[PDB]
């Protein structure tokens, strides 16, 4: 084998970030989703599990899921999220990096079960 690829670079971009999870082989979601306020509609990540489809691409609490494989998770719910989210196996998640991190960092209690 003998192959190399320098590729043509061209990227500048931090939040809005395309995160793509695949539910197949031994690899299933793990993060925990929420549903913000009037003010702050949406789906944001709770909590998310060692190891999970989430964690494999890094997510973290905060990210507020504004798309899903096109879909208008802007103003989803926890039904809708969830029924989406599980009607397909691959699909393209679209987080805004930690977009609302303040709805959890805000104070740090710890619940034990939801």
């Keep these: 084998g003998s192959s190399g690829s320098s590729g043509s670079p061209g990227n500048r971009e931090n ?3 395309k995160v793509f999870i695949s539910l197949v082989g031994s690899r299933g979601l793990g993060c925990s989703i929420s549903s913000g306020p009037i003010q702050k509609p949406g789906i944001f990540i709770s909590h998310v599990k060692p190891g999970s489809l989430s964690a494999e691409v890094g997510l973290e609490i905060g990210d507020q899921i504004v ?4 879909v208008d998770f802007s103003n989803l719910d926890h039904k809708e999220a969830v029924n989406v989210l599980k009607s397909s196996r691959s699909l393209t998640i679209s987080i ?10 805000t104070d740090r209690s710890g619940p034990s079960s939801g």
């Design 15 to 17: 939040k809005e970030k």
């Design 67 to 70: 798309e899903v494989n096109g």
């Design 96 to 105: 805004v990096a930690a977009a609302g991190r303040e709805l959890f960092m």
